[PDB]
Design a protein around this nucleic acid. Sequence first.
RNA 1: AAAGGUGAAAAGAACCCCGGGAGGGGAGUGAAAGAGAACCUGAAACCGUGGACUUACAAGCAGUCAUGGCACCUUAUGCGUGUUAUGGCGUGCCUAUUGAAGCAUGAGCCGGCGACUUAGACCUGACGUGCGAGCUUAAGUUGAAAAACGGAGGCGGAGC
RNA 2: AACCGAACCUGGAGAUAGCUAGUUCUCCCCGAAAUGUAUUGAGGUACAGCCUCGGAUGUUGACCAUGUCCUGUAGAGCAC
RNA 3: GCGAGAGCUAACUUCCGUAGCCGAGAGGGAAACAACCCAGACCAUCAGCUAAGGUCCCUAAAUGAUCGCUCAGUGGUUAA
RNA 4: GUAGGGGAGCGUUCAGUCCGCGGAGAAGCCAUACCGGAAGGAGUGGUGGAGCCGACUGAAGUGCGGAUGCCGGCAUGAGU
Lengths: 71, 117, 65, 84, 142, 94
Amino acid sequence: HDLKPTPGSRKDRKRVGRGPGGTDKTAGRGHKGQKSRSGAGKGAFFEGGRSRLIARLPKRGFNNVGTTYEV
Amino acid sequence: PRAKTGIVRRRRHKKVLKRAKGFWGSRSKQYRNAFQTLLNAATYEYRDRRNKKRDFRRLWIQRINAGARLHGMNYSTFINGLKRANIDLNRKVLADIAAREPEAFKALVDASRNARQ
Amino acid sequence: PKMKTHKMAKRRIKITGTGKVMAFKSGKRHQNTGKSGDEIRGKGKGFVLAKAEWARMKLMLPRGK
Amino acid sequence: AHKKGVGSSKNGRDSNPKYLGVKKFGGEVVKAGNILVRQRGTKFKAGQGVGMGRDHTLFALSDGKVVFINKGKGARFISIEAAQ
Amino acid sequence: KTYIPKNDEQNWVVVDASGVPLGRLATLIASRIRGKHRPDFTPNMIQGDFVVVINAAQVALTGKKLDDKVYTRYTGYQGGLKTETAREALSKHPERVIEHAVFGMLPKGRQGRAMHTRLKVYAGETHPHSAQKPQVLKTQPL
Amino acid sequence: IQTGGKQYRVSEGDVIRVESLQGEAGDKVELKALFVGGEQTVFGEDAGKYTVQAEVVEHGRGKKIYIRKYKSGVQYRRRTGHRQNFTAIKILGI
RNA sequence: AAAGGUGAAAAGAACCCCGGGAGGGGAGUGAAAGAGAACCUGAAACCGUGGACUUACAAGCAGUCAUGGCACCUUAUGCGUGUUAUGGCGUGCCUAUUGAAGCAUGAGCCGGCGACUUAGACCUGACGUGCGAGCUUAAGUUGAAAAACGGAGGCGGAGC
RNA sequence: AACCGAACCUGGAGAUAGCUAGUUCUCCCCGAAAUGUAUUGAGGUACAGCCUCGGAUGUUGACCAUGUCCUGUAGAGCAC
RNA sequence: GCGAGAGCUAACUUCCGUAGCCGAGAGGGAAACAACCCAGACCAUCAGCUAAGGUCCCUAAAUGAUCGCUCAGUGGUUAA
RNA sequence: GUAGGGGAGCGUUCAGUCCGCGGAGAAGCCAUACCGGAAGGAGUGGUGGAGCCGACUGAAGUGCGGAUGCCGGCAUGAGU
Ligand SMILES: [Mg+2]
Ligand SMILES: [Mg+2]
Ligand SMILES: [Mg+2]
Ligand SMILES: [Mg+2]
Ligand SMILES: [Mg+2]
Ligand SMILES: [Mg+2]
Ligand SMILES: [Mg+2]
Ligand SMILES: [Mg+2]
Ligand SMILES: [Mg+2]
Ligand SMILES: [Mg+2]
Ligand SMILES: [Mg+2]
Ligand SMILES: [Mg+2]
Ligand SMILES: [Mg+2]
Ligand SMILES: [Mg+2]
Ligand SMILES: [Mg+2]
Ligand SMILES: [Mg+2]
Ligand SMILES: [Mg+2]
Ligand SMILES: [Mg+2]
Ligand SMILES: [Mg+2]
Ligand SMILES: [Mg+2]
Ligand SMILES: [Mg+2]
Ligand SMILES: [Mg+2]
Ligand SMILES: [Mg+2]
Ligand SMILES: [Mg+2]
Ligand SMILES: [Mg+2]
Ligand SMILES: [Mg+2]
Ligand SMILES: [Mg+2]
Ligand SMILES: [Mg+2]
Ligand SMILES: [Mg+2]
Ligand SMILES: [Mg+2]
Ligand SMILES: [Mg+2]
Ligand SMILES: [Mg+2]
Ligand SMILES: [Mg+2]
Ligand SMILES: [Mg+2]
Ligand SMILES: [Mg+2]
Ligand SMILES: [Mg+2]
Ligand SMILES: [Mg+2]
Ligand SMILES: [Mg+2]
Ligand SMILES: [Mg+2]
Ligand SMILES: [Mg+2]
Ligand SMILES: [Mg+2]
């Protein structure tokens, strides 16, 4: 029981909500919007609904594993 | 493990409620309306600390003007009179002289109208 | 769940030694008789993305390749 | 009672901005190939050390320090004179 | 720590409104009533002096103020706006002109209404208050 | 007859708390008069010449006070403690 | 669907009083009936009895400040506690909004239940720790009021 | 089988919900934005712009003066 | 507010430029009053000076001074 | 000082360890003018009748006024 962990080893987590301390009402999330909502999804490579950068870029060459030499 | 509310909510509540005695009707018996009344009370407390400092100055000034005019002097002329003769009195104090001690206030009057001449 | 690799980004993006991200310049498939010959030359090529676009690509292929 | 239109505009239109004018001003250091004026015409004529693309763009040829020559209106020249 | 006194006095004084401009007399009276002029002055108590008014009927009014100065009452029923000119008010019931001005110049809550009391208007030369032996106060700017 | 920014009224043999003064239990503090609490009266320079004498009686922490601030429809609540330190002072000036 | 609790032990209250009864007051038992079978504690809303100070000329988001009156004295004779009279001052809360006392939303009241989490041996930073040009095991095996083994694998090591 | 432009029961099922509500303990520090372009996009989202924390630099920023170059508005003018 | 378009040189109008404020700003003033004028609130005080704005009574502070003006309640809302 | 970022903490259950209380009476409940910068924390007294505080450490079903939220009790309308 004598022992204690290192200062800065363990930060206590974020408990969002829990009063005007504190992150009041909206728990970081901001006001309204798709970002506000609670669902699993967007995800990460979704820009606008637009037409994605990666989709606009030219593909080059096939793919081959070949042999790799250990240096 | 689970952790019910047990005991905390009622303690908070009683705290508010016990701040709130003497409040009219539900304002002193229902938690929410207590807590609420109390927010507005907050405003009123802070404000009125500053404001009572505003109010008492006023009072002193009233009394001073009165005494001033008993002996045929306006207040403003009485106060430049005092600053001229470099008498340096609080108006709290000036009021109390004016109200409590007649002859003395009189003396300050004569000194001030002299400083005016 | 192991984060998957964004297969679109396979043939169009490159990781670098330092840790920047590359791709090939664009407009080279029927915008030709334009031309100009120095454009056509300058386009078939390759190049580094401006910057804002780096994080996403990095997240596209976790293995770098 | 109410109305039903019908008119419109034939207008609206304009063209995306053409960021023109001088980019390099009087008394400014200059790397080789730094651009100094974007212009529609011969507004600013090349002097010594400055060449001129087809855009009538003036770009400096050999480093140095920028100098403006206004030869009495409508005939003006920009040049580079190196320091020392 | 600042002085709060005790209402001991009941001070009574007689003002003659004869030949005096109405508003000004109204100020002298109103003020003597409210308390200011009293070095001790304390607001949440009424410390004013009792004020008898005489000769209200001879009050001065800066021309052409009679025929033009209008007082307005309202009754609650439609078409209730009843109006009467200074001259009219002054012949019918002068005391109510003085009362009306002075009452305008007191506060309007509980305490002020309570202050109306210590006003006692009479028109003409005499009053019934000689038992209070009130002390006379001159109309002056001072 | 003044300290921490503010005049006070003294006569003789009276305790008075003022803001915290340097010193300790039994210390002595002299003060320049502003006005003579008595006969013929004196004020101004004549008063400053006369002097006042007073023993530091005690150090104290003033009555507690909470500090509440509030602003509507902002979720702005502020609760804070407060205590105002003073020094109690018996008087026996000339 | 809701539902739980006399007492250590039924010793579950013989008998007397009012009442048709219900209910209660005694007595007796019990350590305690301040545990009596509508039986552990028994908060709040909400309903009443009694007492203090108060209110029948009064315009009010009900507070807040200041003072006076009465009352009271177990963190209490002062920085008081309760209560009040009068003056000054004062547009409920939340949400949503360019803008809320708004005649915009929600809400009878109080009590309880009630909302940013878990997972992977994933990704990427901050902090910390152990080893350090190296670092680490997974399944599993054995042991197991503990842990040890286990190098398969994975990460660095060179880029283009 | 007391509400049928497709009955009712259970299940998929915590369907989806760029929408509306709601989001609970305290103090201290800094502190925005409602602009740009792009979007089957217009009350949504991507990237900039603006906020904060940390690590780097080390006066590079700020204002104001001096110097120098750029300008076609105010006015005015009628040379087209 | 200033600079323009649109609009009827209308709108508590619409769309841009620009400064400031509100937004997210309490305090004094403008009766009341996001925006205007003064002014950016760490806490305590029954202390002193000022800003805009004010000093007959409600209401803190000159029923101030001197030279004039208006007599119409103009003051206390419009024009040919 | 709003969204938001950052910092130091208060309180709740359970867990390990230490301290240690408790029928000469625990937790819970009730009153209160004391304490702390705030979450909050003690002193005394009344209740109750068998369990529990403090400290350090660990893990959470961990803190409510809102959701026409859910269950429950009791008000208003009304002696209508
Ligand atoms: Mg935080
Ligand atoms: Mg809320
Ligand atoms: Mg919301
Ligand atoms: Mg002040
Ligand atoms: Mg408000
Ligand atoms: Mg707001
Ligand atoms: Mg029976
Ligand atoms: Mg009663
Ligand atoms: Mg009356
Ligand atoms: Mg009465
Ligand atoms: Mg709206
Ligand atoms: Mg907003
Ligand atoms: Mg309403
Ligand atoms: Mg409403
Ligand atoms: Mg709505
Ligand atoms: Mg309703
Ligand atoms: Mg590290
Ligand atoms: Mg049918
Ligand atoms: Mg659902
Ligand atoms: Mg499904
Ligand atoms: Mg700041
Ligand atoms: Mg929005
Ligand atoms: Mg961004
Ligand atoms: Mg510089
Ligand atoms: Mg012009
Ligand atoms: Mg508009
Ligand atoms: Mg403001
Ligand atoms: Mg204001
Ligand atoms: Mg006002
Ligand atoms: Mg407005
Ligand atoms: Mg001035
Ligand atoms: Mg006055
Ligand atoms: Mg702050
Ligand atoms: Mg424990
Ligand atoms: Mg327990
Ligand atoms: Mg509720
Ligand atoms: Mg309803
Ligand atoms: Mg219900
Ligand atoms: Mg009846
Ligand atoms: Mg009825
Ligand atoms: Mg009936």
